[PDB]
Design a binder for this molecule. Structure first.
Ligand SMILES: [Zn+2]
Ligand SMILES: [Zn+2]
Lengths: 90, 90
């Protein structure tokens, strides 16, 4: 579907960013022709919150830069341990 | 309003939890008689993501325990520096 393809592009762009350990949560909607989205990435649990927020900002910039129809994107982080099977992923 | 009072109770419960530096984002809806909500707390930027996630889990437990109609609550964290005016708050 339309949304599924957009979500796939968001996930691909985010996962290229240094420090990203997968996308854990992602929701998006159209508002008219534009996309509004909210996403949560995994990051190294030993990162500081400060470090994680820099990664989030980099993801925001990357995703917004690659996908023109996204009007609004919020990115936040949660822990994701290497070989984590306890959290969802995209 | 109905939702405003519920949101006020969520914020009060969350802000009592050790390590919480304010609620930055909160959205909630009714699904039938039950509430579904998503919230983002501020935490010390020097906390590890691991530490921040323990705070989030404590907030989840606290809020769910105080407000019976909440069926589903997701809690995540962002940085909030002391005397921060750069992020919204409740
Ligand atoms: Zn935010
Ligand atoms: Zn989560």
């Amino acid at each position: 579907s339309h949304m599924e393809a957009v979500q796939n592009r968001i996930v691909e762009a985010a996962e290229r960013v240094p420090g990203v350990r997968g996308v854990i949560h992602l929701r998006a909607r159209y508002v008219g022709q534009d996309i509004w989205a909210d996403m949560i990435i995994g990051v190294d649990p030993e990162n500081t919150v400060e470090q994680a927020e820099e990664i989030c900002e980099a993801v925001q910039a990357a995703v917004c830069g690659k996908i023109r129809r996204i009007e609004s994107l919020h990115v936040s982080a949660e822990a994701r341990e290497i070989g984590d099977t306890t959290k969802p992923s995209f």
